[PDB]
Design a protein around this nucleic acid. Structure first.
Ligand SMILES: [Mg+2]
Ligand SMILES: [Zn+2]
Lengths: 109, 97, 303, 375, 274, 45, 63, 97, 288
RNA sequence: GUAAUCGCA
């Protein structure tokens, strides 16, 4: 199977509300977009490299359009990196990106 | 003989240019019974909106394989002598006797 | 006024013989012959099909003997199976079998096929049984192109390889008639396709066109299967060794005035290595250049 | 003045929007002209999307790359970062013969990293933390030398999202219009701008008035106007209820004085052009080999826009001619089909249920022949 | 028909047996075979590297072909063997006369020189390019014979000149003008002009066209001093200063094609020498 | 420096031309000339 | 099945027979090419490689 | 300089006619060809005796001819041996028709 | 391997009017190389459009072949010099040009006034040589066509001498095949050699020919939106009146099938055939 | 290893 799992917006709100000890990676994807299908393979490889250190979840943009709209989702191949510390800022990456940059991001910030 | 062959070919080209493509190619489509003059083609285009290409395709759609094969004498790569194309069996039988 | 095509005639003379005729009426002078010859070469040799490639018999000593209860020898049965038309759209090897019993005639209907493969004629004569016998045979179905030479004659016992011809289109022909448009020498194109039932003539035409487009596409690619090939190439160039990363540095990155930049771009000078290899006399050689800009470019290169 | 000294014949086109890799602004359900019989006969082999949805386009970088591949001289204006990804994008643009002299590289800003704040309750995010160097471009950083040689200006709506970047792109557009260039505006409404038609119109109301040529999609045209889409959107037939040419009276309210030609493109299957004196629509092919990666139809719009820009820039005096516009539309459809074929061949098919293929970093892709296996 | 005078097609099943010791030595030298037995077994197994080594072995080795009716001294010659996939020894067409060979069932033998002196002798003396004259009267023995002669005759035959080209006398009343031979050949390739269609070709002051000693059929002299001299096959315009301004040859694409191919063969040989 | 022929070429004319080419340019150039002539002849036939 | 020396009946008996049978074939199966009135027994074929017709007609048969 | 003579010179160099030209040039400077053959044979024998392992895929006679051509001011590849840069891969050999 | 790639192995510039380039296509199956080569050659030689002069206007010259005061060469000579001028443009339709050199200057060259779209490739080309002080004023019309050699706007109505113009930019093209085979597999390699006149590079010519072939082979994929025992039954067996029987015999109608194929209007055409007869034959047929 | 006989070109 795949470590990344489809999650609704309500459980995403619950996860961002409650405290956590692992970085939260949220991927907005749509079945139609081609780039997002590739990004899923990078997410799977990253979840393999980080089995329990980080959590990778995905949400369908077509089913949840208002939630993506309020989160300032400007484009389909976007990734949201949420730091464990509730004081640090979130990181949004737009477009298809290398896996090394994602590793550097989740490591440094 | 080459001079007369070329003269007949040029006359056939002039007839094709004059009468039109549909009217010229109407000799090998016997299942098409409609006015093939340029005036009738223009009238049909004004009425329905089909140019000469559409009407010519519709005419060729009613052509038999047998007829198509005969029409091939009009190919631009290997034009056949129109006199030989329009000869009669009585004259052709006299070739060998 | 446009470019149109249509199917003049569609004739199913038999379940393994089809006929189709198409017309490309508004074609220009030199396009008709090229399109015709390309379509002819594509229909014949560039269209692939599926046929039986291997037959396994139960208890025959050799392929040049006779089995009791069958009017045909093993070689005749192989020749009959060689002419079995099949339809498939996926590559690879699949397995089939023939399980008939009792006196009668075994045909292509007795063949049990995978869900992907299908039979076209369904009534071809495989063999004739004149006695109550159990006829069991195995078949391997493969999809390829052209003709296949039965190279592994010496192979696993009990299986005989049959050469197969994967050409679905039997014959093709084209004729170019004039359009009589005066100065603009336009012509009319006709196409005749004879298939064997595996695919209709229109499908054969579309497949030939798509194959020609696929063959002509690579010329429009970049000069010599991952979306991050450019990043990997740049990383390797900058990491491996010097004088190779210098190639990855262009005049664009080197700050330069518009005049010198445009003059070097017109001079087919793009990377910094080309600028370094070129001499100062060659730089002065180009038009709309002066000795003043040479000092500027030399200084900003030393910087 | 270096105009007579070194300008050159192909006039320069300027791309201002953004440099991104495999980015999709938005997507709307659409219809396609395909042979349903050939699809149903080869349903197993061919990859056909269950619901067909296409994108208005890609990014300005892809447009510049396509226009350079078409032989035209393109220049990309923008700002990136000193990180490895920005340098890779710059190298990719340079290797495709695109002028990147107007590309600025700053280390203080990252290429694609947008720091944002969690915000108040309800998941309301905010980007006040730090931009991503794609919405950050100062007015003083605009390269006037490129705009002087440029006779055409191309930008997109994705830039106008940020208030600073909107002011920057408006300054660039007005500077180009004052230095004598025709503004090409490709409106590609991003995902947030599909909430309300009036808000989307007011947002793009600073645009649509300083441009001479505007390219819009059929869905975006229906959204901007009051027309509601009424189509099955999934039936296996072409019933002439899709690919419909809207009357010029519907186009008239959104027309303005400086506007010259308006293009409505429903993919590469049918492109409608609207002019003050004439209106017509040219059909095209859209039944092309499609992979899951290529299902988006992003390269088609980029090729169409590149062909249109190339054809218009070469003969600016014939922008309003009927025959020249028809030739331009045919060339754009051909370029879109070619680019779609090239992207389908370059990026193959995802591995099937049986995947035992050597993997590249974070990716694994096979060919059309490898994907068409029995199991 | 696509071999050169020095190259001959040789089947692989014959070459592997003729050069067997050489390919054994090759397998022993490279890290492909330990001993003679393993190398012989690999050669019998028809491994792909064996064919590569066989090709690399005979790139500079000469083959001596010969025929059973060795009447003259040209019965035995020497060629460069080229590996082919078949069982029939290919031979150059122009060299057939020497061997009195026709492809109706004739067979030939093959011989491999082992010694270095024999190899030098075969490569220098017994090659075809060194034997182009029969030792009887010293006449060219290798010449176009059956099909090449027909092609050359069709090229240089000519055109219908008199009543065949025109039905009525031109008194009551050729056309194409080409500056270069390349333009005329390109027009022929583009089917603009037929093979026998007449044309005019401008020449750069050479006058090398062989023709009859015939005076101009008509001469046009204008007031300003330029007089046009019309000949049978060429037009020579001159001026008052007795200066040859222009020369136009009236010919067909066949003659210019033959002349250009011979001249370009000579020039390509001269350029390749350097 | 070669002549330009506007007459029909036959077997005896070809033999004469080949002999003259062997005399002027030698056998080395004549080999390549003859190969090119053979190629053109086969093509036209 | 023809006995030898068919010219005992008339002159050019073989030629008459051959040309008559070709004409009939051409008429019945309407392939005009089989009998060309200009050059009986010869047809004009094309090249498989380039697709251009040959200049002179060639003999087409099934021996 | 003829414009369309690239492929001809390329084929002349690739085929091996350079060897024939060099042989003719070296025989144009010798009274008796038999003594020249014997001298070339002796020089090739010396070359083989000096370095046995060097040869086996490179011909000593071609090496002698290339040395004699290079010593005369004409550049020639060592032993007239060239490799195909367009080879697909190991084990793939061209088919010369 | 398994991905078709192209590379320019050789390229050179012998002069400003001659270019050479050689290309490669490594992975190719048997039979594809020859077809691709033939199609690419046909596209390069016929499907690439060029720009050249198609018309001239010589007000001073009263004849096609004459010597003007200070031109020093015949009008035919200057026309042959003009037809060799190479131009680079992306024109749609016709245009006008002009050369208005007025001086005793030795050479007239690169003095043609062209719109921005059209450009010259080689300036050193020699149009004419003025040996005396004179005003050389010639008008030129330039067109761009896909090898349409025959184009006459007015058929020499005014004092305009039509110039023969070849619209082929590619001077020559050729292809070769190298077949590399290891065991069962056989790979072919295509080598394309292109010679251009300097208006475009061989790589650009390759790209244009490929795009032209693709555009030629696309319309086939286009789709349009949507909104017998009668032989043996001769007419002799069926009881018919003698008159209509003889009419059908004269009209080459011997079997029922034939009659059935014939239509009522067509039947009426036969001589001596009344309309009532059409009724009689129809009634007898319906009786059967 | 020799004959006989036929074929080959
Ligand atoms: Mg014989
Ligand atoms: Zn007889």
């Amino acid at each position: 199977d795949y470590l990344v799992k489809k999650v609704s917006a309500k459980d995403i709100q619950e996860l961002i509300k409650g405290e956590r000890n692992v970085p939260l990676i949220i991927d907005f994807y749509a079945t139609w977009c081609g780039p997002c299908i590739l990004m899923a393979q990078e997410l799977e490889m990253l979840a393999v490299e980080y089995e329990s250190n980080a959590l990778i979840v995905k949400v369908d943009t077509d089913d949840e359009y208002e939630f993506a709209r309020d989160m300032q989702v400007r484009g389909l191949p976007t990734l949201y990196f949420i730091s464990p510390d509730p004081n640090k800022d979130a990181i949004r990456t737009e477009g298809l990106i290398p896996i090394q940059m994602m590793r550097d991001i989740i490591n440094n910030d | 003989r080459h001079l007369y062959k070329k003269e007949r070919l040029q006359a056939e080209k002039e007839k094709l240019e004059k009468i039109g493509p549909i009217a010229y190619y109407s000799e090998w489509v016997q299942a098409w019974k409609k006015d093939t003059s340029r005036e009738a083609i223009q009238k049909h285009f004004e009425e329905t909106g089909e140019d000469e290409n559409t009407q010519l395709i519709e005419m060729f759609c009613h052509q038999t394989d047998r007829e198509y094969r005969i029409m091939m004498g009009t190919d631009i790569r290997i034009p056949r002598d129109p006199l030989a194309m329009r000869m009669r069996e009585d004259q052709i039988k006299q070739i060998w006797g | 006024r446009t470019l149109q095509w249509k199917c003049v005639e569609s004739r199913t003379d038999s379940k393994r013989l089809y006929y189709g005729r198409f017309i490309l009426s508004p074609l220009m002078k030199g396009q008709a012959d090229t399109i015709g010859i390309a379509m002819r070469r594509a229909l014949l040799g560039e269209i692939e099909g599926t046929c039986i490639t291997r037959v396994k018999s139960e208890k025959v000593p050799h392929e040049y003997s006779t089995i009791t209860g069958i009017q045909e020898s093993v070689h005749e049965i192989l020749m009959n199976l060689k002419e079995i038309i099949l339809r498939s759209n996926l590559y690879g090897t699949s397995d089939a079998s023939i399980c008939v019993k009792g006196p009668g005639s075994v045909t292509a209907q007795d063949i049990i096929l995978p869900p992907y493969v299908e039979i076209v004629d369904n009534t071809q004569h495989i063999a004739s049984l004149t006695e109550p016998i159990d006829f069991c045979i195995g078949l391997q179905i493969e999809r390829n192109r052209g003709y296949l030479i039965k190279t592994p004659h010496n192979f696993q016992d009990g299986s005989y390889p049959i050469d197969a011809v994967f050409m679905p289109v039997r014959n093709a022909n084209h004729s170019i008639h004039s359009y009589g448009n005066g100065n603009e020498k336009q012509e009319i194109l006709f196409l005749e396709i004879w298939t064997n039932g595996s695919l209709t003539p229109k499908e054969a035409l579309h497949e030939a066109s798509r194959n020609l487009i696929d063959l002509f596409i690579p010329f429009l690619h970049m000069e010599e299967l991952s979306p991050f090939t450019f990043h990997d190439k740049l990383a390797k160039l900058i990491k491996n060794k010097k004088k190779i990363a210098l190639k990855s540095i262009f005049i664009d990155q080197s700050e330069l005035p518009s005049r010198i930049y445009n003059c070097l771009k017109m001079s087919n000078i793009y990377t910094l290595l080309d600028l370094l290899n070129n001499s100062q006399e060659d730089l002065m050689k180009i038009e709309h250049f002066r000795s003043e800009d040479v000092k500027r470019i030399l200084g900003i290169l030393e910087k | 003045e270096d105009i007579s000294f070194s300008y050159g014949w192909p006039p320069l086109v300027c791309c201002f929007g953004a440099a991104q890799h495999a980015f999709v602004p938005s997507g709307r359900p659409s219809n396609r002209l395909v042979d349903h019989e050939w699809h149903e006969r080869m349903k197993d082999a061919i990859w056909d999307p269950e619901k067909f949805t296409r994108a208005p386009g890609g990014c300005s970088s892809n447009v510049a790359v396509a226009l350079a591949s078409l032989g035209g001289k393109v220049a990309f204006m923008g700002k990136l970062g000193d990180d490895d990804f920005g340098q890779s994008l710059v190298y990719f643009m340079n290797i495709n013969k695109v002028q990147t002299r107007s590309v600025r590289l700053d280390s203080k800003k990252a290429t694609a990293i947008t720091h944002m704040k969690i915000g108040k309750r309800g998941g309301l995010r905010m980007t006040t933390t730090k931009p991503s160097a794609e919405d950050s471009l100062l007015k003083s950083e605009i390269n006037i030398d490129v705009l002087k040689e440029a006779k055409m200006f191309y930008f997109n709506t994705f830039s106008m999202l940020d208030p600073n970047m909107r002011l920057t792109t408006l300054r660039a557009t007005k500077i180009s219009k004052k230095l004598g260039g025709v503004v090409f505006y490709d409106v590609n409404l991003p995902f947030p701008l599909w909430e309300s038609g009036d808000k989307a119109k007011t947002f793009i109301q600073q645009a649509w008035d300083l441009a001479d040529i505007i390219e819009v999609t059929k869905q975006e045209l229906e959204f901007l106007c009051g027309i509601k889409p009424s189509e099955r959107f999934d039936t296996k037939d072409n019933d002439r209820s899709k690919f419909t040419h809207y009357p010029p009276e519907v186009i008239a309210p959104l027309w303005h004085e400086n506007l010259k030609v308006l293009f409505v493109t429903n993919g590469t299957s049918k492109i409608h052009y609207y002019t003050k004196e004439h209106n017509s629509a040219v059909l095209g092919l859209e039944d092309v080999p499609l992979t899951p990666y290529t299902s988006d139809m992003s390269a088609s719009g980029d090729g169409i826009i590149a062909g249109i820009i190339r054809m218009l820039t070469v003969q600016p005096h014939l922008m309003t001619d009927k025959g020249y516009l028809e030739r331009t539309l045919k060339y754009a459809i051909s370029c879109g089909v070619v680019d779609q074929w090239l992207q389908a061949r370059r990026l193959g098919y995802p591995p099937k249920e049986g995947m035992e293929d050597d993997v590249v970093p974070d990716d694994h892709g096979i060919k059309s022949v490898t994907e068409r296996e029995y199991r | 028909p696509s071999l050169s005078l020095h190259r001959c097609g040789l089947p692989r099943e014959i070459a592997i047996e003729l050069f067997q010791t050489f390919v054994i030595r090759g397998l022993i030298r490279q890290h492909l075979a330990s001993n003679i037995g393993v190398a012989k077994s690999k050669i019998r197994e028809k491994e792909p590297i064996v064919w590569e080594i066989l090709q690399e072995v005979m790139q500079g080795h000469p083959v001596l072909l010969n025929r059973a009716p060795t009447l003259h001294r040209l019965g035995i010659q020497a060629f460069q063997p080229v590996l082919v996939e078949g069982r029939a020894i290919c031979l150059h067409p122009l060299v057939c006369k020497g061997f009195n060979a026709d492809f109706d069932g004739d067979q030939m033998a093959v011989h491999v020189p082992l010694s270095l002196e024999a190899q030098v002798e075969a490569r220098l003396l017994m090659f075809s390019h060194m034997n182009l004259l029969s030792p009887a009267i010293g006449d060219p023995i290798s010449v176009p014979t059956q099909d090449m002669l027909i092609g050359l005759y069709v090229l240089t035959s000519g055109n219908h000149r008199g009543i065949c080209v025109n039905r009525y006398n031109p008194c009551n009343r050729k056309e194409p003008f080409f500056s270069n031979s390349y333009d005329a050949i390109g027009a022929y390739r583009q089917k603009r002009i037929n093979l026998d269609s007449p044309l005019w070709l401008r020449w750069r002051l050479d006058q090398r066209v062989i023709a009859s000693r015939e005076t101009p059929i008509e001469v046009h002299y204008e007031s300003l001093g330029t007089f046009y001299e019309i000949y049978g096959h060429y037009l020579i315009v001159r001026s008052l200063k007795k200066q040859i301004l222009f020369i136009y040859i009236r010919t067909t694409v066949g003659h210019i094609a033959l002349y250009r191919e011979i001249e370009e063969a000579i020039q390509g040989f001269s350029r390749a020498y350097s | 420096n070669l002549v330009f022929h506007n007459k029909a070429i036959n077997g005896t004319a070809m033999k004469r031309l080949i002999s003259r080419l062997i005399d002027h340019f030698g056998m080395a150039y004549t080999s390549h000339i003859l190969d090119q002539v053979k190629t053109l002849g086969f093509q036209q036939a | 099945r023809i006995a030898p020396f068919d010219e005992r009946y008339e002159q050019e008996a073989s030629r008459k027979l051959v040309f008559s049978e070709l004409y009939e074939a051409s008429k019945q199966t309407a392939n005009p090419w089989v009998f060309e009135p200009e050059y009986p027994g010869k047809s004009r074929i094309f090249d498989g490689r380039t697709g251009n017709p040959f200049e002179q007609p060639v003999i087409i048969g099934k021996p | 300089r003829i414009p369309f003579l690239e492929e001809q010179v390329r084929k002349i160099r690739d085929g091996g006619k350079l060897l024939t030209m060099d042989i003719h040039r070296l025989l144009l400077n010798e009274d008796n060809r038999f003594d020249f053959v014997n001298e070339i044979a002796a020089e090739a024998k010396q070359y083989v005796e000096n370095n046995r392992d060097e040869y086996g895929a490179k011909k000593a006679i071609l090496h002698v001819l290339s040395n004699r051509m290079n010593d005369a001011g004409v550049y020639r590849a060592e032993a007239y041996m060239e490799s195909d840069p367009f080879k697909p891969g190991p084990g793939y050999m061209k088919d010369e028709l």
